[PDB]
Design a protein around this ligand. Structure first.
Ligand SMILES: CC(=O)SCCNC(=O)CCNC(=O)[C@H](O)C(C)(C)COP(=O)(O)OP(=O)(O)OC[C@H]1O[C@@H](n2cnc3c(N)ncnc32)[C@H](O)[C@@H]1OP(=O)(O)O
Ligand SMILES: CC(=O)SCCNC(=O)CCNC(=O)[C@H](O)C(C)(C)COP(=O)(O)OP(=O)(O)OC[C@H]1O[C@@H](n2cnc3c(N)ncnc32)[C@H](O)[C@@H]1OP(=O)(O)O
Ligand SMILES: O=P(O)(O)OC[C@H]1O[C@@H](O)[C@H](O)[C@@H](O)[C@@H]1O
Ligand SMILES: O=P(O)(O)OC[C@H]1O[C@@H](O)[C@H](O)[C@@H](O)[C@@H]1O
Lengths: 165, 165
């Protein structure tokens, strides 16, 4: 229930050293369903009603693929989930069978925004991608939050195109 | 050796109906290493020397994940690989445990460009994403090829940001 999704060694030690007092950054675990996880995602976009059985099934799917999916959380110093982020590591043939990190689903509870938590999430996901051998990490963002990603040391690389069904 | 990576039923019948005479669109198979596959990817970006053993290992990794990775090819009417495209299907918690299709590594041999082959690749990957239950498909592109994606029925949705190691 409390077993981390992936090795705690994958959490950047430099990030751990600089996080605000009593805050924690750590891998997701199954029991995080009970600690406000999905409510944090609600700042990003819509989530829907997800029951515990459905959570458990999707969590186990992800856990079976813990060398592709890295989901982590930031907890306040009450252990409440206040921030989320994901890295998905894609395998390619190009770049001598290279791997690309994709940062996804970055969210910080409104009341906890503007305290460097999002920066620490991005730094932590960047650390994972580099450590496992990715040649780059990419993500898509809006014009309104490009400046956040600039401050995280990302640069504009292209355009996101979409087709919604 | 010739076994398709994924079910031929996942190849859009409408696309099959409209492809240029004697051209084929089909899933990747292991033996495509021998039919010019990696040379097509060289129009996109750099590939590197990949030997057959390395190909086989990465192919088998992908094949083990054929419900996440869909790689397909366009063959001319000599059965030579002249176009490539990939869809990677990401699992989310948001959107009621939704899935997002990611189109990757689209390439058409220079001599075979401008004949609707890239369009057919995108239509085929779109068909797979919708059929397996994705709520959208996204990709990143350059300013110089945005017009191609417009003609494929995609719309600008945001910015791609990158951090190269
Ligand atoms: C890949 C994706 O998932 S894109 C989707 C990102 N998520 C969202 O937009 C959902 C709503 N927003 C949020 O959850 C958060 O505000 C985030 C994730 C965008 C940023 O996290 P925060 O914890 O609020 O920001 P954090 O304090 O770490 O910001 C670091 C720096 O960027 C600044 N910043 C934060 N958001 C923005 C913005 N939209 N534009 C410009 N600057 C910003 C901060 O003020 C800070 O600046 P400083 O170094 O001068 O102090
Ligand atoms: C997600 C990614 O992988 S992005 C990377 C895409 N790949 C590359 O850029 C590598 C180099 N280029 C290529 O491999 C190819 O030219 C592709 C994939 C971009 C396009 O494939 P093609 O087979 O050449 O194009 P196709 O003939 O299907 O094009 C469909 C329509 O778009 C047009 N078109 C093609 N490329 C472009 C472009 N860069 N800008 C504007 N229009 C374009 C065609 O002329 C055609 O127009 P029409 O309907 O008026 O005839
Ligand atoms: O609900 P959507 O319209 O799919 O938006 C959600 C998406 O926003 C993008 O900007 C982020 O890069 C993605 O990580 C996130 O999944
Ligand atoms: O070699 P890179 O710099 O990683 O470029 C290759 C990448 O180009 C992008 O525009 C495409 O969306 C990706 O699918 C492709 O993987």
């Amino acid at each position: 229930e409390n077993t981390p999704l992936f090795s705690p060694s994958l959490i950047s030690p430099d990030v751990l050293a600089v996080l605000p007092a009593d805050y924690t950054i750590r891998p997701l675990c199954r029991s995080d369903y009970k600690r406000g996880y999905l409510d944090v995602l609600r700042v990003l976009t819509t989530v829907g009603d997800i029951n515990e059985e459905q959570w458990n099934s999707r969590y186990e799917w992800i856990r079976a693929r813990s060398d592709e999916y890295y989901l982590l959380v930031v907890c306040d110093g009450e252990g409440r989930i206040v921030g989320t982020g994901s890295l998905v590591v894609e395998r390619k043939f190009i770049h001598s069978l290279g791997m690309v990190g994709h940062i996804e689903d970055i969210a910080v509870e409104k009341g906890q925004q503007g305290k460097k938590l999002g920066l620490r999430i991005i730094q932590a996901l960047d650390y994972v991608a580099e450590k496992v051998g990715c040649y780059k990490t990419i993500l898509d963002c809006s014009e309104a939050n490009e400046g956040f990603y600039i401050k995280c040391g990302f640069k504009r690389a292209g355009l996101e195109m979409a087709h919604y069904y």
